């Protein structure tokens, strides 16, 4: 994630093994109850798209759900591209498949930010809300 350090600078830190372990338990215990989303959001404060994909890929054994999540990402990414006539990020850049970590940090700390972590996070949360609904 991008965090404010003690000096007050916005700096990058790797997503921590602690965070990732907590996210593993969340999914394991709770599957897709309403509270999975609050946990996800809390654990992904300041996350880059790289961070978010590390979290997503830890999800094992929920194959249909994770396909629904991909569907949402693809839909949101396609609409992003259509609304951002064709360096500025594309939908695939927001989702981290085609952008580098340094590009992501570059957008996130741009003046004013191009908050790709928050955008991708919005897509994911939209996806998770649809999954949670399905398990209700």
């Amino acid at each position: 994630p991008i965090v404010q350090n003690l000096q007050g600078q916005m700096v990058h830190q790797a997503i921590s093994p602690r965070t990732l372990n907590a996210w593993v338990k969340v999914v394991e215990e709770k599957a897709f109850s309403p509270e999975v989303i609050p946990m996800f959001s809390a654990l992904s404060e300041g996350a880059t798209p790289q961070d978010l994909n590390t979290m997503l890929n830890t999800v094992g054994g929920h194959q249909a759900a994770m396909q629904m999540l991909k569907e949402t990402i693809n839909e949101e990414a396609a609409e992003w591209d259509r609304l951002h006539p064709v360096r500025e990020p594309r939908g695939s850049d927001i989702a981290g498949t085609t952008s580098t970590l340094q590009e992501q940090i570059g957008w996130m700390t741009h003046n004013p930010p191009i908050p790709v972590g928050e955008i991708y996070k919005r897509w994911i949360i939209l996806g998770l809300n649809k999954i949670v609904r399905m398990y209700s």
Partner: peptide, 15 residues
């Protein structure tokens, strides 16, 4: 699409 079925999240596409 950005993500193919059974393409991990974040995986750059093979094409």
């Amino acid at each position: 699409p950005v993500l193919f079925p059974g393409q991990p999240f974040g995986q750059p596409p093979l094409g």
